[PDB]
mmCIF file of C-alpha atoms in Angstrom:
data_model
loop_
_atom_site.group_PDB
_atom_site.id
_atom_site.type_symbol
_atom_site.label_atom_id
_atom_site.label_comp_id
_atom_site.label_asym_id
_atom_site.label_seq_id
_atom_site.Cartn_x
_atom_site.Cartn_y
_atom_site.Cartn_z
ATOM 1 C CA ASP Y 1 28.754 -9.963 -5.189
ATOM 2 C CA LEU Y 2 28.807 -6.740 -3.029
ATOM 3 C CA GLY Y 3 25.383 -5.798 -4.567
ATOM 4 C CA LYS Y 4 23.917 -9.055 -3.086
ATOM 5 C CA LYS Y 5 25.255 -8.179 0.450
ATOM 6 C CA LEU Y 6 23.613 -4.685 0.045
ATOM 7 C CA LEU Y 7 20.237 -6.359 -0.877
ATOM 8 C CA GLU Y 8 20.507 -8.646 2.244
ATOM 9 C CA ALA Y 9 21.505 -5.587 4.411
ATOM 10 C CA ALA Y 10 18.813 -3.171 3.022
ATOM 11 C CA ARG Y 11 16.085 -5.842 3.699
ATOM 12 C CA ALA Y 12 17.182 -6.869 7.273
ATOM 13 C CA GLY Y 13 17.753 -3.132 8.070
ATOM 14 C CA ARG Y 14 21.503 -3.083 9.007
ATOM 15 C CA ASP Y 15 22.142 0.740 8.939
ATOM 16 C CA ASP Y 16 25.913 0.104 9.614
ATOM 17 C CA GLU Y 17 26.583 -2.653 6.973
ATOM 18 C CA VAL Y 18 24.798 -0.569 4.216
ATOM 19 C CA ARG Y 19 27.346 2.303 4.811
ATOM 20 C CA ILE Y 20 30.400 -0.101 4.902
ATOM 21 C CA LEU Y 21 29.301 -1.872 1.627
ATOM 22 C CA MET Y 22 28.619 1.609 0.051
ATOM 23 C CA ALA Y 23 32.145 2.846 1.083
ATOM 24 C CA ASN Y 24 33.600 -0.190 -0.857
ATOM 25 C CA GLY Y 25 31.589 0.998 -3.944
ATOM 26 C CA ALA Y 26 28.753 -1.614 -4.090
ATOM 27 C CA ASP Y 27 26.087 -1.285 -6.881
ATOM 28 C CA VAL Y 28 23.247 0.950 -5.452
ATOM 29 C CA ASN Y 29 20.819 -0.315 -8.207
ATOM 30 C CA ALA Y 30 21.646 -4.050 -7.578
ATOM 31 C CA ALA Y 31 18.527 -5.999 -8.789
ATOM 32 C CA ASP Y 32 17.590 -9.412 -7.208
ATOM 33 C CA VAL Y 33 15.727 -12.324 -8.994
ATOM 34 C CA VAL Y 34 12.320 -10.456 -9.241
ATOM 35 C CA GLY Y 35 14.115 -7.116 -10.041
ATOM 36 C CA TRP Y 36 14.065 -5.382 -6.583
ATOM 37 C CA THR Y 37 16.817 -2.761 -5.833
ATOM 38 C CA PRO Y 38 17.901 -2.173 -2.185
ATOM 39 C CA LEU Y 39 15.588 0.940 -2.371
ATOM 40 C CA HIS Y 40 12.586 -1.428 -3.078
ATOM 41 C CA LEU Y 41 13.424 -3.633 0.000
ATOM 42 C CA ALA Y 42 14.066 -0.502 2.191
ATOM 43 C CA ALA Y 43 10.679 0.984 1.024
ATOM 44 C CA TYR Y 44 8.756 -2.352 1.505
ATOM 45 C CA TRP Y 45 9.976 -3.404 5.029
ATOM 46 C CA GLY Y 46 10.126 0.324 6.043
ATOM 47 C CA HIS Y 47 13.759 1.419 6.788
ATOM 48 C CA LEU Y 48 13.545 5.266 6.379
ATOM 49 C CA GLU Y 49 17.218 5.917 7.432
ATOM 50 C CA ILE Y 50 18.519 3.364 4.806
ATOM 51 C CA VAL Y 51 16.154 4.809 2.070
ATOM 52 C CA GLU Y 52 17.889 8.247 2.550
ATOM 53 C CA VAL Y 53 21.471 6.740 2.728
ATOM 54 C CA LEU Y 54 20.752 4.880 -0.607
ATOM 55 C CA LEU Y 55 19.288 8.000 -2.393
ATOM 56 C CA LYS Y 56 22.293 10.043 -1.018
ATOM 57 C CA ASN Y 57 24.618 7.773 -3.138
ATOM 58 C CA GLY Y 58 22.375 8.253 -6.254
ATOM 59 C CA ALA Y 59 20.012 5.225 -5.877
ATOM 60 C CA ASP Y 60 17.618 5.105 -8.924
ATOM 61 C CA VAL Y 61 14.304 6.488 -7.446
ATOM 62 C CA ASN Y 62 12.242 5.323 -10.526
ATOM 63 C CA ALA Y 63 13.881 1.830 -10.725
ATOM 64 C CA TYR Y 64 11.088 -0.727 -11.544
ATOM 65 C CA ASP Y 65 10.828 -4.564 -11.081
ATOM 66 C CA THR Y 66 9.835 -7.222 -13.731
ATOM 67 C CA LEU Y 67 6.151 -6.031 -13.290
ATOM 68 C CA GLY Y 68 6.951 -2.239 -13.319
ATOM 69 C CA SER Y 69 6.461 -1.396 -9.566
ATOM 70 C CA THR Y 70 8.709 1.479 -8.221
ATOM 71 C CA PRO Y 71 9.662 1.920 -4.503
ATOM 72 C CA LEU Y 72 6.959 4.700 -4.297
ATOM 73 C CA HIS Y 73 4.368 1.889 -4.993
ATOM 74 C CA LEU Y 74 5.710 -0.298 -2.097
ATOM 75 C CA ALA Y 75 5.968 2.800 0.219
ATOM 76 C CA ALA Y 76 2.392 4.075 -0.555
ATOM 77 C CA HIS Y 77 0.858 0.516 -0.338
ATOM 78 C CA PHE Y 78 2.314 -0.432 3.136
ATOM 79 C CA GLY Y 79 1.498 2.979 4.755
ATOM 80 C CA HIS Y 80 5.105 4.345 5.097
ATOM 81 C CA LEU Y 81 4.272 8.133 5.096
ATOM 82 C CA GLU Y 82 7.868 9.311 5.934
ATOM 83 C CA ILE Y 83 9.424 7.172 3.088
ATOM 84 C CA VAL Y 84 6.799 8.432 0.508
ATOM 85 C CA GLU Y 85 7.749 12.101 1.338
ATOM 86 C CA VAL Y 86 11.550 11.312 1.077
ATOM 87 C CA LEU Y 87 11.060 9.478 -2.309
ATOM 88 C CA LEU Y 88 8.849 12.337 -3.714
ATOM 89 C CA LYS Y 89 11.484 14.909 -2.475
ATOM 90 C CA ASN Y 90 14.207 13.050 -4.528
ATOM 91 C CA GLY Y 91 12.008 13.338 -7.695
ATOM 92 C CA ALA Y 92 9.927 10.092 -7.634
ATOM 93 C CA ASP Y 93 7.311 9.768 -10.471
ATOM 94 C CA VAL Y 94 3.978 10.273 -8.551
ATOM 95 C CA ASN Y 95 2.007 8.942 -11.623
ATOM 96 C CA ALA Y 96 4.372 5.900 -12.044
ATOM 97 C CA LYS Y 97 2.351 2.999 -13.624
ATOM 98 C CA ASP Y 98 3.173 -0.770 -13.358
ATOM 99 C CA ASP Y 99 2.198 -3.357 -16.083
ATOM 100 C CA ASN Y 100 -1.424 -3.129 -14.691
ATOM 101 C CA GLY Y 101 -1.547 0.731 -14.969
ATOM 102 C CA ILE Y 102 -1.754 0.996 -11.109
ATOM 103 C CA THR Y 103 -0.303 4.244 -9.552
ATOM 104 C CA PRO Y 104 0.880 4.744 -5.914
ATOM 105 C CA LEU Y 105 -2.386 6.778 -5.378
ATOM 106 C CA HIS Y 106 -4.480 3.587 -6.113
ATOM 107 C CA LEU Y 107 -2.426 1.472 -3.596
ATOM 108 C CA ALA Y 108 -2.691 4.318 -0.983
ATOM 109 C CA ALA Y 109 -6.480 4.639 -1.724
ATOM 110 C CA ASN Y 110 -7.004 0.795 -1.672
ATOM 111 C CA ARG Y 111 -5.390 0.198 1.804
ATOM 112 C CA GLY Y 112 -6.784 3.663 2.779
ATOM 113 C CA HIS Y 113 -3.703 5.589 4.092
ATOM 114 C CA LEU Y 114 -5.331 9.093 3.914
ATOM 115 C CA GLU Y 115 -2.119 10.851 5.195
ATOM 116 C CA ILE Y 116 -0.193 9.454 2.123
ATOM 117 C CA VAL Y 117 -3.120 10.068 -0.366
ATOM 118 C CA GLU Y 118 -2.965 13.841 0.504
ATOM 119 C CA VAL Y 119 0.905 13.940 0.099
ATOM 120 C CA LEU Y 120 0.685 12.223 -3.376
ATOM 121 C CA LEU Y 121 -2.122 14.683 -4.439
ATOM 122 C CA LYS Y 122 -0.048 17.648 -3.040
ATOM 123 C CA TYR Y 123 2.969 16.476 -5.199
ATOM 124 C CA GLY Y 124 0.628 16.447 -8.278
ATOM 125 C CA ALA Y 125 -0.992 12.951 -8.487
ATOM 126 C CA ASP Y 126 -3.626 12.579 -11.302
ATOM 127 C CA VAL Y 127 -6.995 11.621 -9.626
ATOM 128 C CA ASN Y 128 -8.438 10.691 -13.104
ATOM 129 C CA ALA Y 129 -5.504 8.179 -13.559
ATOM 130 C CA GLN Y 130 -7.110 4.812 -14.614
ATOM 131 C CA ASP Y 131 -5.675 1.224 -14.365
ATOM 132 C CA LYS Y 132 -6.143 -1.623 -16.966
ATOM 133 C CA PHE Y 133 -9.799 -2.089 -15.721
ATOM 134 C CA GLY Y 134 -10.491 1.714 -15.941
ATOM 135 C CA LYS Y 135 -10.614 2.326 -12.126
ATOM 136 C CA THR Y 136 -9.740 5.725 -10.481
ATOM 137 C CA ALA Y 137 -8.766 6.266 -6.775
ATOM 138 C CA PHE Y 138 -12.381 7.617 -6.353
ATOM 139 C CA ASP Y 139 -13.877 4.317 -7.744
ATOM 140 C CA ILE Y 140 -11.815 2.371 -5.086
ATOM 141 C CA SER Y 141 -12.954 4.622 -2.134
ATOM 142 C CA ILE Y 142 -16.710 4.200 -3.044
ATOM 143 C CA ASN Y 143 -16.352 0.388 -3.674
ATOM 144 C CA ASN Y 144 -14.293 -0.073 -0.419
ATOM 145 C CA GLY Y 145 -16.858 2.170 1.413
ATOM 146 C CA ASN Y 146 -14.188 4.638 2.736
ATOM 147 C CA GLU Y 147 -16.139 7.987 2.787
ATOM 148 C CA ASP Y 148 -13.334 9.963 4.599
ATOM 149 C CA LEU Y 149 -11.187 9.231 1.453
ATOM 150 C CA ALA Y 150 -14.150 9.792 -0.985
ATOM 151 C CA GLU Y 151 -14.514 13.541 -0.044
ATOM 152 C CA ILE Y 152 -10.722 14.245 -0.560
ATOM 153 C CA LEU Y 153 -10.898 12.909 -4.199
ATOM 154 C CA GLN Y 154 -14.455 14.401 -4.702
ATOM 155 C CA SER Q 1 -13.107 -7.970 7.746
ATOM 156 C CA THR Q 2 -16.790 -6.811 7.418
ATOM 157 C CA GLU Q 3 -15.539 -4.176 4.859
ATOM 158 C CA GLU Q 4 -14.271 -6.899 2.419
ATOM 159 C CA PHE Q 5 -17.476 -9.047 2.819
ATOM 160 C CA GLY Q 6 -19.592 -5.848 2.378
ATOM 161 C CA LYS Q 7 -17.980 -4.995 -1.026
ATOM 162 C CA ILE Q 8 -18.620 -8.571 -2.417
ATOM 163 C CA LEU Q 9 -20.025 -7.985 -5.979
ATOM 164 C CA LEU Q 10 -23.323 -9.966 -6.423
ATOM 165 C CA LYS Q 11 -23.883 -8.580 -9.998
ATOM 166 C CA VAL Q 12 -23.589 -5.455 -12.276
ATOM 167 C CA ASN Q 13 -26.723 -3.853 -13.892
ATOM 168 C CA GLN Q 14 -27.195 -2.971 -17.639
ATOM 169 C CA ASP Q 15 -26.426 0.745 -16.779
ATOM 170 C CA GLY Q 16 -23.024 -0.239 -15.205
ATOM 171 C CA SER Q 17 -24.586 0.026 -11.674
ATOM 172 C CA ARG Q 18 -22.992 -2.438 -9.142
ATOM 173 C CA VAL Q 19 -25.088 -4.438 -6.563
ATOM 174 C CA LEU Q 20 -22.809 -5.255 -3.535
ATOM 175 C CA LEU Q 21 -23.585 -7.637 -0.575
ATOM 176 C CA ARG Q 22 -23.904 -4.599 1.825
ATOM 177 C CA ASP Q 23 -26.727 -3.269 -0.497
ATOM 178 C CA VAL Q 24 -28.948 -6.360 0.337
ATOM 179 C CA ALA Q 25 -27.669 -7.285 3.889
ATOM 180 C CA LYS Q 26 -26.019 -6.007 7.141
ATOM 181 C CA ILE Q 27 -22.361 -7.181 7.686
ATOM 182 C CA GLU Q 28 -21.041 -7.685 11.290
ATOM 183 C CA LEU Q 29 -19.114 -10.153 13.544
ATOM 184 C CA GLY Q 30 -21.756 -12.260 15.413
ATOM 185 C CA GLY Q 31 -22.064 -15.583 17.330
ATOM 186 C CA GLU Q 32 -22.358 -18.929 15.427
ATOM 187 C CA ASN Q 33 -25.529 -19.378 17.601
ATOM 188 C CA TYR Q 34 -27.310 -16.826 19.919
ATOM 189 C CA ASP Q 35 -29.049 -19.622 21.967
ATOM 190 C CA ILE Q 36 -26.741 -19.428 25.087
ATOM 191 C CA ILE Q 37 -26.639 -16.147 27.173
ATOM 192 C CA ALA Q 38 -24.712 -16.205 30.537
ATOM 193 C CA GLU Q 39 -24.722 -13.645 33.448
ATOM 194 C CA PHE Q 40 -22.454 -13.537 36.596
ATOM 195 C CA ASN Q 41 -24.477 -11.835 39.431
ATOM 196 C CA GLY Q 42 -26.717 -10.254 36.697
ATOM 197 C CA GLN Q 43 -23.615 -8.788 34.896
ATOM 198 C CA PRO Q 44 -22.970 -9.674 31.190
ATOM 199 C CA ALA Q 45 -20.439 -12.600 31.091
ATOM 200 C CA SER Q 46 -19.202 -15.803 29.342
ATOM 201 C CA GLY Q 47 -17.600 -18.954 30.890
ATOM 202 C CA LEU Q 48 -16.070 -22.448 30.323
#
């Protein structure tokens, strides 16, 4: 029950209510219907302060939904540079693959957040990493036509 | 966006070489018709 209030709080971005529900010992890895932890919702909507407060109380950094997408996927896809660095600092799997074999590097490369692409690479992201269709981050940059991104991946 | 229309895949060659829409055409936002051109005191303009 408390885990549901934490999901609602983490999404909306209530920095106070998250702390009060945590103090009463609410589940930090409380999954919703699709399998999203509060850390997923905080990473998606972009609530950096809540992402840290969750990880502080041992929030599962490599928790994955019913399709295998970690918060680092949602952070890297929606151009949340600060959240990506915080997640990677707390030991997030940089080569984390969903059911489709898609890594945070692909999602960063696809939307073209070059600041995040460099952080992922600097934390040891595999450029040669392929998806189910056999596509690298380099294949995306050429297809998309992003040539600023193409030189970074070589 | 012009990016997304540009990367439209028309076909793939026998050597795994892709032919995109931007490889056979220019992609840009442009008027439905270029028939009407208005000027206010010789200065580029539109109006209702």
